[PDB]
Scaffold this active site. Structure first.
Site, PDB file in Angstrom:
ATOM      1  N   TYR A  45       0.752  -1.204  -0.161  1.00 43.94           N
ATOM      2  CA  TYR A  45      -0.022   0.088  -0.067  1.00 43.94           C
ATOM      3  C   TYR A  45       0.852   1.270   0.084  1.00 43.94           C
ATOM      4  CZ  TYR A  45       0.977   0.751   4.850  1.00 43.94           C
ATOM      5  OH  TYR A  45       1.627   0.894   6.110  1.00 43.94           O
ATOM      6  N   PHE A  55       1.876   9.591   3.996  1.00 44.80           N
ATOM      7  CA  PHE A  55       2.303   9.150   5.154  1.00 44.80           C
ATOM      8  C   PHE A  55       3.019   7.697   5.498  1.00 44.80           C
ATOM      9  CE2 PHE A  55      -2.214   8.147   5.208  1.00 44.80           C
ATOM     10  CZ  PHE A  55      -2.243   6.764   5.643  1.00 44.80           C
ATOM     11  N   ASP A  56       2.856   6.924   4.660  1.00 43.10           N
ATOM     12  CA  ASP A  56       3.323   5.610   4.790  1.00 43.10           C
ATOM     13  C   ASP A  56       3.210   4.670   3.489  1.00 43.10           C
ATOM     14  OD1 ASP A  56       4.211   3.183   5.820  1.00 43.10           O
ATOM     15  OD2 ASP A  56       2.192   2.662   6.770  1.00 43.10           O
ATOM     16  N   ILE A  75      -7.695  -0.193   9.953  1.00 47.51           N
ATOM     17  CA  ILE A  75      -8.834   0.917   9.875  1.00 47.51           C
ATOM     18  C   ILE A  75     -10.097   0.148   9.304  1.00 47.51           C
ATOM     19  CG2 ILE A  75      -7.562   2.821  10.123  1.00 47.51           C
ATOM     20  CD1 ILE A  75      -7.497   3.287   7.023  1.00 47.51           C
ATOM     21  N   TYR A 101      -9.256   7.160  11.265  1.00 47.78           N
ATOM     22  CA  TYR A 101      -8.907   7.311  12.734  1.00 47.78           C
ATOM     23  C   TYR A 101      -9.684   8.524  13.431  1.00 47.78           C
ATOM     24  CZ  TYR A 101      -4.646   4.725  11.105  1.00 47.78           C
ATOM     25  OH  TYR A 101      -3.819   3.745  10.760  1.00 47.78           O
ATOM     26  N   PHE A 118      -5.611   5.612  -0.155  1.00 50.07           N
ATOM     27  CA  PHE A 118      -4.635   4.608  -0.353  1.00 50.07           C
ATOM     28  C   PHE A 118      -4.560   3.861  -1.888  1.00 50.07           C
ATOM     29  CE2 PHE A 118      -5.897   4.738   4.042  1.00 50.07           C
ATOM     30  CZ  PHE A 118      -4.918   4.572   4.835  1.00 50.07           C
TER      31      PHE A 118
END
Length: 128
Positions: A45, A55-56, A75, A101, A118
């Site tokens: 991802y 962010f990741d 999530i 979140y 994503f």
């Protein structure tokens, strides 16, 4: 950008039809089988805030992210979205905070009431 394209064109895959999880298939996967609740799913991802901020990504570490589908290990948007994917599929998801979140967020990366984007690749899924 991709997040705006999901907001504009994405399929609402929530049962409530609240636009909480919106989806676009970017590459079609193999055959017809989707993972079952409890299956171990293996994903790559790339995660962004809706404003486009990365962010990741599992690719930086070259380590697929593994979780048990539908178990709340991730999530809600992922439990929902991944369950709709075929092996080899790449999709884009846009995820309202209620399915991510929430008002708490996940600081420092994720602010309060964040919508998340994503790109997810379902690499594999296993019974166990």
């Amino acid at each position: 950008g991709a997040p705006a394209t999901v907001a504009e064109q994405g399929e609402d895959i929530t049962s409530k039809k609240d636009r909480g999880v919106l989806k676009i298939v970017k590459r079609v996967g193999n055959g017809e089988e989707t993972p079952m609740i409890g299956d171990k799913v293996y994903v790559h991802y790339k995660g962004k805030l809706s404003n486009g901020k990365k962010f990741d990504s599992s690719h930086d570490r070259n380590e697929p992210f593994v979780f048990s589908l539908g178990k709340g290990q991730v999530i809600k948007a992922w439990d929902i979205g991944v369950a709709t994917m075929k092996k080899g599929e790449i999709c884009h998801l846009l995820c309202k905070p209620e399915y991510a979140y929430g008002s708490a967020g996940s600081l420092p990366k994720i602010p309060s009431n964040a919508t998340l984007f994503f790109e997810i690749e379902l690499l594999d899924f296993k019974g166990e």
